[PDB]
Every structure is written in C-alpha cells, then in structure tokens.
Ligand binder design. Structure first.
Ligand SMILES: [Mg+2]
Ligand SMILES: [Mg+2]
Lengths: 97, 98, 94, 146, 56, 113, 223, 231
DNA sequence: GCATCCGTGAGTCGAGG
RNA sequence: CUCGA
C-alpha cells in the first residue's frame, strides 16, 4: 500500500464501497481511515478484489495468497477413451477390456 | 532438502574443489586431491511411469564448491529443495459454478 | 425436457405405452422417408446447418411432435400387421 | 509417399519427427495367411488386373490419443554382435516418443492438505479477479471445500 | 489418420448427433439415476461436462 | 440475496413522527435496518425512507447504490404494500419469469424467509 | 474475423431483444457491461420530482375523502410516463383539480403545450362523496435515479420531494453464450434485453447508449 | 447541468509505463470506460513474438548441446522472453541469426542486427557457452495477436525447426483507478486513471489508442440492424 | 434335543503391469 | 497385486 500512496494514488471508490460492506460485516472498526481498515483486512489475510468482467469489486474482501499446488499423474489425456467396434474375446465373443 | 538428498535425485560434490567443466550433459570437478572427477548427467530419461528423469547443472565453470554442495538438480528439485509443484496466487471464492 | 412431455404423459395410461408409440412411429417415418408425416410444412422440425434450416433428421423428434397434434391414432388391435404394412407401402413406396 | 514420409531407409521413423495418431513408427510386412480368394476378390482382381501382393501391412502405428516427438530409436538384430533374441525373433525395434503436456481441462490438481480437484475452466487473463494494482490471480478455489 | 481429418466432418458430426442422446454412467451404480440420458453438446478438450444439478 | 440485515445502532428507539426517525438516521443515531418503533407499530428507518412503486424501481435503486439487496424496504408488488428486501423481490421475479406465471409463482415461494 | 450480424426483435415500444454474433472471445461482456451501465444511468428521461397537495402538510399524512394515503398517491405519480415533445423544455408543472365520486386518471391532468402523457389510463386516486383533490406536480428532465432527499426541491413549504425516476429504461439484462464459426471455437454471442417505459423505445435507448459511449471514447484525444 | 468533455492528461516513463487521466466524468463512468479498455488492452493488442527456432545439430526440443549449460527447452523458455520491435509497419516476420562460440554468456544483444528491427531487452540471458561450446540459431519472430500455442500454429521454416508458443501481447499489466472528484457544486464525480505497463515493443499510449479504436470499431457493429426471422 | 466340521459367500467400475 | 472414484 505504501508503494501505492508513494506513486501518487489515493484510495479507490470501489475500495470505499467494499470497506462499507466490511464495516457491516464487522471485519473493520468503524471510525478509522480507509488505510487503517484496509490494513485490518490485510491482517485478516483479505484484500479488495475486482471482477475482471465488470471492473466492479467483489462485494466482500477476499482471502488471497500464495499456495503450493501440484499437478497429479491423473491426466485426462491418459484417460479419455472411446470405441465404436473393436476386438472381441476368444470364447465369449464379447469386446475386450 | 533431506528428501532430495536421500532419494539420490540430485548430484552433490564428493569433496571440496573447483568446478572445471559445466555442460548440459556432464560436470567435471577438480577436487582438493587434484583428481578430475567427471559426473555424467542423466538427460530426458524415462521412468517407470513415463515421467521425465533429468539432471540440470546448478554450478558454473570455476565455481568453488565444498563437500556436499549441490552440483545438479534432479527431477522435482529446485536448488536442492523438493519441488513437487508450483507456487500460485489463489483467491478463495465461488466463481460462476466453475 | 422434451417439449410437451407433460401432455404426452397425459395421453397414455402408461408412460411405456408412450415410448412404444413414439418408437414405432419413428420407425414408420424412417421406413417411408418421412413422406407419411402428418405435419404441415410449417410444423416441420428444423435443424440449423451451415447453409440454413433443413429438415430435422431425427425421427423420434418428428414422432413426438406428430403425437402432440392428435392426428395419430394408437391402441391395440387397430389393424392386422401385414395389412398396415401393405397399405403404407401402397401409399408411400420405399 | 505421404504415409512413408518420416520413415528412414530401413523403415523406422526418424529422430525429431512429429507423430500423430495413425502415423507409422515402424514399418513391417508379414506374409499373408494362405489366401483362398473369394470369387468377388477374383473378379475385382480381374477388373483391375493387379496381382495381390504376397505380404501385408503389419506396421507399428501411433495409438489413438497419443503421439509427440520421436527422441530415440533402438534396433536389435539377429546375427549381430552382442545380440541374441528369444527363439524365432529376427529383430526388435523400440521407439521413444516424448510429449510436452500443458495443463488442460480435466487434469487433477492438489495441495498438501488434501484439497484436490480437476481443472474445469481455463479463463483468459482479463476474466480473472484481480488486485487493485492490476495483478490477476492464478487459481480460484471454492470456500465450500473447507 | 488424424492429420487427414478435415473441418467439414465435424459439421457432419453435428448433424449426426442432432436430437440424439447418450447415456452417462457413474460407478458405483447404486440406483437407476446412476445412469441418465443427455443431449450431447460437442466440446473441444477431453473431459465430459456434467450438469451440476445431477451430481447429487 | 434473500437474507436481511439486522442492525444494532438504532436498538429500539421510540419515535412519534417518522420525520424524527429520518432525522435521527440523518444524524447517525439510528441504523437503516435497526428495529425501532415509530408511533405504536414496530418498523425501521429503511421502510419509511425508501418506498418504491414497483420491483423495477427498487432494483434500479440497487443498481445506483441507493440501497443494497439485503436492506429492508417498502415495495409495492401486485397491489400489495410489502415490507421486504429488494433481494427477495428479485428472487420472486426469478421464480416468476422462470415459470411464466406471476400468480402461481407468488403462491409457491415463501417470501418472509 | 467477419463482421457480426446485428439482429433485433421488438414487442411494441416497451421491450426489445438484441443479438450480436459472432464476437471475438470475451467481447460479449466487454460490450455488454458498459452498455448496461450507460442504459441505466445516462439515458435522458422525465420524472415527477415534487408534489404539492392542498391541506396536506407532510408525506405521511392522510387525505379526507380520498381512499389512498399520500404515500400511495406519490407512488402512482412515480409511474407517470411524461414525454417532452420540444427538446428546449426543461421542466413543467402539471395541475389537477377534481372532486366528488370520481376515479382520477392521468388523463385528468390539465394539458400543457408540448407535454405528452404516454399513460393517460394510469390510476392516481379515487375520491368519495365530498372528497376533494387539488395538486400540483413538478416534472423535470434528467437521467438515472435521484432519491427525494438528494435533490430536495421545493417551490413552496408543503411541497413534498419525490424520488426522481428519470431513467426511461426500467431494466437491462444481457447474457453471453459460447458460439462457433467453422472451427473458431471460443467466440461470443451477445444477447441484450431492454425494458423501457414507452417514452423512449428499446432500440432508441440502445442507440443513445452506444453514442454516449462512442463520444466518451473521443475524450482520449487532446492532452 | 450536462457534464461536458473532461481534461485528458498523459504521463509517461520511457516506453514501458504510462498513466492516462480523464476528469471529471459522470458518476460510474470511471468503471464504464476503464474496464472495457482494460479487457481490450490485455487481450487484443497486436505485438511480436518468437514463433520458431532452429538450432544447428539439434533435431528437437528435448535435447542438449555440447558445451552449453542450458538444455534446448530452457533456451526456448528464455527466447519466449525476447522482446522485438518492428519499426516498419509492413514487416510481418523476421529471422534473427545468432552465431556464438567459446566461453561466454550469450545475451539477446548477440543477435545479428537487422534493418528496422530493435531488441528492447538486449540484456536477456539466452545460454551459457563453455570452452568449445558452439551455438548457431535462427529464430523466427512474427507479428500476431493473443496467445498462440506451438501446437496450433506449427510454424517451421526448415525440417528441424522447433515451433515456439507465441505470446504476442506487448501489454504486461493494466490497472485503473477511480477516484472521487468534483466540478462546481456537483459531487461524486469520477476521475479515471489508466495505468499501463508494456514491454516497450509498443508504448502504453499506442496501446491505449488502438484499444480505443478497437472498442469504437466494435461500437460500429450496432449500426445495421436486422429483423429476426424466428417468427 | 444340543455342540461339531464343512462349504460358501464377502461393492463397482476404471488404471498400471 | 498397486492406484483411482
Ligand atoms: Mg422516501
Ligand atoms: Mg466464448
């Protein structure tokens, strides 16, 4: 945030809206400045987030952060399979598996 | 780190020394004894499950290395640390049923 | 849901009878190249191609839509089977 | 020639060739089983005036849904140094095919805390929720999973 | 051969599936609703798309 | 969208004339959705301050940020003066348009919950 | 990518569905959202901004001889659809005097030059034997939605400020569906639905909206 | 009472970063204008990208080069970061040549100069060459838009060429600020600030301009209505 | 009228090898 | 057998 205030930008209108909602949610203490409240939220691990489709903020502050996620060996490329007709079994004459 | 080390994924310096050669295929190290030890690097090898087994050199020519220092990262290794995935920026929220 | 499914279910004493009627009718349409349809040209089910609206190839869709008109008759023992076959062959040859 | 394009002189796909489902990896011919040509085959043969070949196509092809780049070939032949195959086997050919798999819809992701799920949607960057500084998030996890 | 497959055959495929349904089945099939019929919509990608209200 | 706000700032204050309630709210002494008692009947500031002629007006007000979906408010719907939130009206309309029958849809849903 | 076909479907002067396809991936919501915002806030209309009623002090009073309370009458005045025929005109005052057993409609309002009432059959109030209604209603031109206590206009002391529903557009809804062109797979299909009051048609409302947006785009010109 | 044309301010830092202010705007227009521009800036701005790579004595991406520390996959990963500016609008494709050898850390600078072609990030590391290490590359860079995977374009100048994933977009980041402002007695008016980060291939201002143009052109599409043939 | 030995069942599909 | 639901 200090970077933002240094770059010459104040608090956003949408951020103010989210802060109002957050005050209603009991997430921030009423009376404090926008920066203090945003800081409270951030300390709760929450930030203001904008919907990329509308540019309007999500009505509540959202938990955002780095997470370690792995891609598992179960890939759909190895699993998708289809058959019209194909080989049949010797004795049963039923499709192979 | 212990997981990477004990699984023998990565390559480590046998003793103190200086890195003589660095290649995608091989690392040559000159130890304190004066002997030249050449470590071939396993490259794009196929494991039992078809996943890639390859070692990337993590040292440069002329680098001074001590005993047990990292020479090459194996698969799922980032500077000697177990690297099973990716660090990504996440948001915890519903999103249109997706 | 299939268009007018509630009415269709309302038309029979058993839902399975509805299925039998729809299926046999579909077969009748396929067998006679849809020439025996009770649908007026404007009531014909359509499918959007790359070119434009063409007839819907799906005979079950046709059958259900025809059933919704009331122009079809169903029941047991309406007519001997071979007589039905021969009359439909006479009116609409294959 | 289109189907044989990437095969080398000996009938083995070349290193570096991109292979797709249906493509031949190793060409192979097998002498046909004792054929008693049905009358249809005889008449057709007469019409086109072409002798039926002695051997038939039994080549190794890329299975459906597979493929990629050929990176290694191994050929073991009978009558050659260091080589002795199982009885009756003239030669064995192995082809290694590498693929670079990008994350796709249906691939399984997980964290170390037992949260797992398949990718259901890949959104363009402008559709992602973003921080006021313009930074889009990478992954959206549902709170209902907690 | 996949490289021989041209665009038009996809359009043809679209006409083939018109109005038709497929059966979707998840094991274990504990009751009849473990199999259900659906009108398929062709998609790119290799995953089947299942409606949320039928999941339960 | 169908849950309503319950607030503590007002905390059950008594008012004679509604203008006094609106005044107190303007001062910042009574919350919009706090349960108060103007005259004898129990109510709240929001139900007095915002009285909409129809669902469209209320939702237009929502779009303009005048009130939220959860704010308890007064709306005229199907010849009735309803004390409800815009969100419940929106739900009612979702059902109504889904089923193409405003009357039956009104009979089906439970609005006050 | 070939230019999209623009398709229209109207039901009188009140409702219209607008379809735009095909669009490049994402442009469905890129166009839909701004237009929706503009259509709900920037389309010029008219609205009742102030009401004076004889012998009535405040909004929560009751009128002798009239079945409706002041609140109910004001609500009905909010639904009045007034159209200004002359683009010069900014504001009008409409007078209405009636008594006895009668059901007052919007027709009853004394006509004013270049002021059209689109809904003359609109109910205002019912009066009883001896019931008397004398009212003056201020009608202004504007945009969007302005609550009573935000414009707070009064010509006299007992004039009641009314929530100003300027917007001729009652509701906007849009949806974006995936569509394809040959083997272009991720294309967008924009469908826009617009509800108006009749004073301005859905199509007219849209054309004004795209013009407002186009004009704002030209503001990125001269530093 | 109708608000009129607002002041448009431009601030720039080199070719990389730019701020674009518009004030005052009517309430809600900061988002109404800000977001569609952000969506277009992030997705539809044409640019340049390495689309193909040929390396001598290399048959495919899954390889190593004698005397080179990096494997081919890593080298291509590095080349995906190459920012190339075309001075001539007509120029659609360029083949950069790199001939290097001996002990050295090859940078993007080492590409042979080409008329009307500038490398915006010449300090970009490409490969570490050892004693006896040689590297002879031909990289094909094309004009394009959006994200085009190697699997989709399959561009190969020669038989052993390696298709490269193409991220054409020259726009690195976009944010926008909506701040409270006033004019005369009007309150709750919008001050809009577009913050644009590009790679230097095209300037933030150029990007803003062609984004605006794209949006305007899309607005043109509402010009010719058509009756629905559904009935 | 009651303990003892024997024969028989014990979810699905899917994957690898 | 091991893995998956
Ligand atoms: Mg009010
Ligand atoms: Mg799409």
């Amino acid at each position: 945030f200090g970077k933002r205030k240094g770059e010459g930008f104040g608090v956003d209108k949408r951020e103010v809206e989210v802060l109002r909602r957050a005050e209603k949610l009991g997430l921030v203490t009423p009376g404090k400045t926008p920066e203090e409240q945003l800081k409270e939220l951030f300390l709760q691990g929450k930030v203001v987030l904008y919907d990329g489709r509308t540019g309007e903020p999500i009505e509540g502050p959202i938990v955002v952060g780095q997470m370690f996620i792995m891609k598992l060996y179960h890939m759909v490329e190895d699993k998708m399979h289809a058959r019209s007709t194909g080989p049949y079994s010797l004795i049963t004459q039923q499709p192979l598996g | 780190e212990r997981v990477v080390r004990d699984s023998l994924a990565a390559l480590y310096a046998e003793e103190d020394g200086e890195v003589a050669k660095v290649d995608g295929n091989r690392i040559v190290v000159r130890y304190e004894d004066g002997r030249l030890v050449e470590y071939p690097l396993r490259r794009f090898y196929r494991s039992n499950q078809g996943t890639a087994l390859d070692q990337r050199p993590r040292v440069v020519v002329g680098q001074r290395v001590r005993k047990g220092d990292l020479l090459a990262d194996g698969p799922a290794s980032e500077n000697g640390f177990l690297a099973l995935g990716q660090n990504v920026l996440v948001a915890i929220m519903p999103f249109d049923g997706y | 849901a299939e268009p007018g499914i509630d009415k269709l279910f309302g038309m029979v004493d058993s839902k399975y009878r509805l299925t039998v009627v729809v299926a046999k009718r579909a077969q009748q349409l396929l067998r006679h190249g849809f020439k025996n349809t009770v649908l007026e040209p404007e009531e014909r089910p359509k499918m959007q191609t790359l070119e434009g609206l063409f007839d819907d190839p799906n005979a079950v869709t046709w059958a259900m839509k025809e059933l919704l008109t009331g122009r079809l008759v169903f029941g047991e023992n309406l007519v001997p089977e071979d007589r039905l076959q021969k009359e439909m062959e006479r009116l609409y040859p294959v | 020639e289109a189907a044989l394009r990437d095969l080398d002189e000996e009938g083995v796909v070349r290193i570096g060739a991109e292979v797709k489902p249906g493509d031949i990896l190793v060409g192979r011919t097998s002498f046909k089983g004792e054929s008693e040509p049905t009358p249809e085959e005889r008449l057709l043969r007469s019409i086109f005036g072409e002798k039926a070949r002695d051997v038939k196509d039994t080549s190794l092809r890329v299975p459906p849904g597979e493929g990629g780049i050929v990176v290694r070939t191994v050929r073991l032949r009978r009558g050659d140094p260091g080589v002795e195959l199982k009885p009756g086997v003239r030669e064995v050919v192995r082809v290694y095919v590498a693929q670079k798999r990008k994350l796709q819809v249906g691939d399984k992701l997980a964290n170390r805390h037992g949260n797992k799920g398949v990718v259901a949607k890949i959104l363009p960057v402008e559709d992602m929720p973003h921080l006021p500084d313009g930074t889009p998030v990478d992954v959206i996890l549902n709170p209902l999973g907690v | 051969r996949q490289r021989d497959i041209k665009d038009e055959v996809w359009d043809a495929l679209e006409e083939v599936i018109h109005g038709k349904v497929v059966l979707l089945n998840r094991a274990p099939t504990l009751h009849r609703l473990g199999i259900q019929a659906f009108q398929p919509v062709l998609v790119e990608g290799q995953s089947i798309q299942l409606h949320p209200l039928v999941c339960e | 969208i169908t849950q309503v706000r319950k607030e503590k700032k007002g905390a059950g204050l008594e008012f004679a004339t509604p203008e006094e309630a609106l005044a107190a709210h303007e001062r910042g002494e009574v919350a919009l959705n706090a349960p108060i008692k103007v005259a004898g009947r129990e109510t709240s500031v929001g139900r007095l301050k915002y009285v909409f002629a129809n669902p469209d007006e209320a939702l237009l007000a929502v779009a303009h940020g005048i009130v939220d979906l959860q704010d308890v408010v007064t709306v005229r719907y199907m010849g009735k003066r309803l004390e409800t939130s815009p969100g419940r009206i929106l739900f009612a309309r979702i059902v109504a348009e889904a089923v193409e029958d405003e009357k039956v849809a009104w009979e089906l849903i439970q609005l006050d919950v | 990518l070939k230019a999209p076909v623009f398709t229209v479907r109207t039901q009188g002067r009140e409702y219209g569905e607008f379809v735009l396809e095909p669009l490049e991936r994402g442009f469905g919501v890129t166009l839909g959202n701004p237009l929706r915002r503009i259509l709900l806030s920037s389309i010029p209309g008219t609205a009742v901004t102030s009401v004076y009623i004889e012998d009535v002090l405040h909004e929560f009073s009751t009128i002798p001889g009239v079945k409706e309370d002041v609140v109910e009458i004001i609500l009905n005045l909010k639904e009045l659809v007034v159209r200004f025929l002359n683009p010069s005109l900014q504001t009008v005052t409409l007078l209405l005097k009636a008594e006895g057993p009668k059901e007052v409609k919007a027709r009853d309002f004394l006509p004013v030059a270049d002021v059209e009432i689109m809904n003359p059959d609109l109910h205002i109030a019912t009066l009883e034997e001896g019931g008397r209604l004398n009212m003056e209603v201020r009608v202004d031109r504007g945009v969007g939605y302005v609550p009573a206590e935000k414009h707070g206009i009064k010509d006299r002391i007992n004039a009641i400020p009314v929530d100003a529903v300027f917007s001729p557009v009652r509701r906007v809804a849009f949806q974006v569906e995936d569509t394809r062109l040959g083997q272009r797979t991720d294309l967008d299909k924009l469908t826009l639905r617009i509800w108006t009051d009749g004073s301005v048609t859905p199509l007219e409302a849209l054309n004004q909206a795209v013009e407002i947006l186009r004009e704002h785009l030209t503001y990125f010109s001269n530093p």
